[PDB]
Amino acid sequence: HSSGLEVLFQGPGSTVVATARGIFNSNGGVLSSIETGVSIIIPQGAIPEGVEQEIYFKVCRDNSILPPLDKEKGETLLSPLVMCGPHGLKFLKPVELRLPHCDPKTWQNKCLPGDPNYLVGANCVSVLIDHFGSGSGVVYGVVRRS
């Protein structure tokens, strides 16, 4: 039993509930998405000079996706999916992507006001992207093993 980062694919009509977008230049910067809690930090250099790349990640719901995990054993998704804006992107340096992944304790908890955001932002999933693949629905997603 363990959790990690994985790149899932979208088959049917994906459910886009959140959409983060931000044009980034060689200068660098980060793209935060409060709608879900996902933030992408780009190191000063990932993007070349004299260029402007519109990087937007759309956070979808966990319903219209192809989860390779095994729910029969208990596996599942505890992190909001993501849809890479541009398809076939290649940075000069890897970008740090962070997702709002909480502990498995709240996997089915009603969520109390005492600390419903405690680890929601602490145990975030970090993934480095130098180049973003190009697929019909190359999305991300935390894999909850069983």
XYZ file of all heavy atoms in Angstrom, residues 24 40 42 45-48 53 55 86 89-95 129-132:
171
model
N 4.284 31.830 -19.622
C 5.577 31.884 -18.961
C 6.719 32.078 -19.951
O 6.735 31.496 -21.037
C 5.765 30.620 -18.121
C 4.528 30.275 -17.334
C 4.122 28.959 -17.179
C 3.760 31.280 -16.762
C 2.976 28.655 -16.468
C 2.617 30.979 -16.051
C 2.224 29.668 -15.904
N 2.412 24.907 -10.233
C 3.562 24.502 -11.038
C 4.655 25.563 -11.009
O 4.487 26.654 -11.547
C 3.157 24.247 -12.504
C 1.981 23.272 -12.571
C 4.342 23.714 -13.301
C 1.508 22.992 -13.981
N 8.235 26.916 -12.175
C 9.179 26.784 -13.277
C 10.484 27.523 -12.985
O 10.492 28.742 -12.825
C 8.587 27.324 -14.593
C 7.296 26.581 -14.941
C 9.599 27.200 -15.723
C 6.087 27.485 -15.014
N 14.866 29.270 -16.512
C 15.700 28.636 -17.518
C 14.964 27.561 -18.297
O 15.375 27.197 -19.399
N 13.876 27.051 -17.727
C 13.088 26.010 -18.380
C 12.614 26.458 -19.758
O 12.464 25.646 -20.670
C 11.902 25.624 -17.509
N 12.379 27.758 -19.905
C 11.926 28.320 -21.169
C 13.029 29.172 -21.802
O 13.728 29.907 -21.106
C 10.645 29.168 -20.967
C 9.453 28.251 -20.664
C 10.351 30.039 -22.185
C 8.112 28.953 -20.702
N 13.201 29.080 -23.133
C 14.223 29.847 -23.848
C 13.928 31.343 -23.846
O 12.860 31.774 -23.411
C 14.168 29.291 -25.274
C 12.803 28.710 -25.410
C 12.413 28.228 -24.039
N 5.466 31.057 -23.891
C 4.690 29.822 -23.925
C 3.520 29.868 -22.949
O 3.706 30.086 -21.752
C 5.584 28.625 -23.598
C 6.776 28.478 -24.530
C 6.373 28.460 -25.992
O 6.995 29.114 -26.828
N 5.325 27.707 -26.307
N 1.295 28.156 -20.721
C 1.153 26.895 -20.015
C -0.080 26.918 -19.125
O -0.175 27.713 -18.191
C 2.399 26.577 -19.165
C 3.635 26.486 -20.061
C 2.204 25.280 -18.386
C 4.909 26.178 -19.307
N -0.602 22.869 -23.634
C -0.009 22.586 -24.941
C 0.449 21.139 -25.069
O 1.079 20.592 -24.163
C 1.189 23.531 -24.999
C 1.568 23.756 -23.575
C 0.293 23.672 -22.779
N 5.114 19.754 -25.667
C 5.949 20.846 -25.188
C 7.268 20.309 -24.649
O 7.305 19.248 -24.036
C 5.213 21.622 -24.094
C 5.938 22.858 -23.568
C 6.331 23.776 -24.715
C 5.063 23.595 -22.566
N 8.352 21.039 -24.878
C 9.657 20.601 -24.404
C 10.466 21.766 -23.844
O 10.967 22.610 -24.588
C 10.430 19.911 -25.527
C 9.958 18.492 -25.795
C 11.091 17.484 -25.659
C 11.816 17.279 -26.980
N 12.140 15.844 -27.216
N 10.595 21.791 -22.522
C 11.347 22.835 -21.836
C 12.837 22.517 -21.828
O 13.238 21.368 -22.012
C 10.867 22.975 -20.389
C 9.375 23.019 -20.233
C 8.685 21.949 -19.681
C 8.664 24.136 -20.631
C 7.311 21.997 -19.532
C 7.292 24.191 -20.485
C 6.614 23.121 -19.935
N 13.652 23.537 -21.584
C 15.096 23.360 -21.516
C 15.485 22.794 -20.153
O 16.563 22.223 -19.984
C 15.811 24.692 -21.758
C 15.211 25.557 -22.868
C 15.843 26.940 -22.865
C 15.394 24.888 -24.222
N 14.585 22.957 -19.182
C 14.803 22.464 -17.829
C 13.494 21.927 -17.252
O 12.413 22.389 -17.615
C 15.352 23.578 -16.936
C 16.508 24.342 -17.558
C 17.528 24.762 -16.512
C 16.995 25.883 -15.633
N 18.065 26.845 -15.251
N 13.574 20.941 -16.348
C 12.389 20.339 -15.731
C 11.652 21.306 -14.810
O 12.265 22.012 -14.010
C 12.956 19.169 -14.927
C 14.377 19.533 -14.670
C 14.823 20.328 -15.863
N 10.328 21.323 -14.925
C 9.497 22.194 -14.100
C 8.886 21.416 -12.941
O 8.402 20.299 -13.119
C 8.370 22.848 -14.921
C 8.950 23.779 -15.974
C 7.483 21.787 -15.558
N 8.865 18.120 -14.888
C 8.584 17.997 -16.310
C 9.503 18.855 -17.152
O 9.404 20.082 -17.158
C 7.138 18.386 -16.636
C 6.181 17.680 -15.687
C 6.809 18.043 -18.081
C 5.259 18.617 -14.938
N 10.354 18.193 -17.908
C 11.252 18.880 -18.813
C 10.534 19.057 -20.136
O 10.632 20.095 -20.784
C 12.544 18.082 -19.007
C 12.282 16.647 -19.418
O 11.976 16.416 -20.607
O 12.384 15.753 -18.551
N 9.781 18.025 -20.502
C 8.988 18.029 -21.723
C 7.620 17.399 -21.461
O 7.526 16.340 -20.840
C 9.735 17.311 -22.858
C 8.937 16.255 -23.566
N 9.229 14.910 -23.488
C 7.849 16.355 -24.365
C 8.356 14.228 -24.209
N 7.509 15.082 -24.750
N 6.563 18.048 -21.934
C 5.211 17.539 -21.744
C 4.750 16.758 -22.973
O 4.703 17.292 -24.082
C 4.247 18.687 -21.453
C 4.035 18.948 -19.986
C 4.516 20.109 -19.399
C 3.345 18.040 -19.195
C 4.312 20.362 -18.057
C 3.140 18.288 -17.853
C 3.623 19.451 -17.282
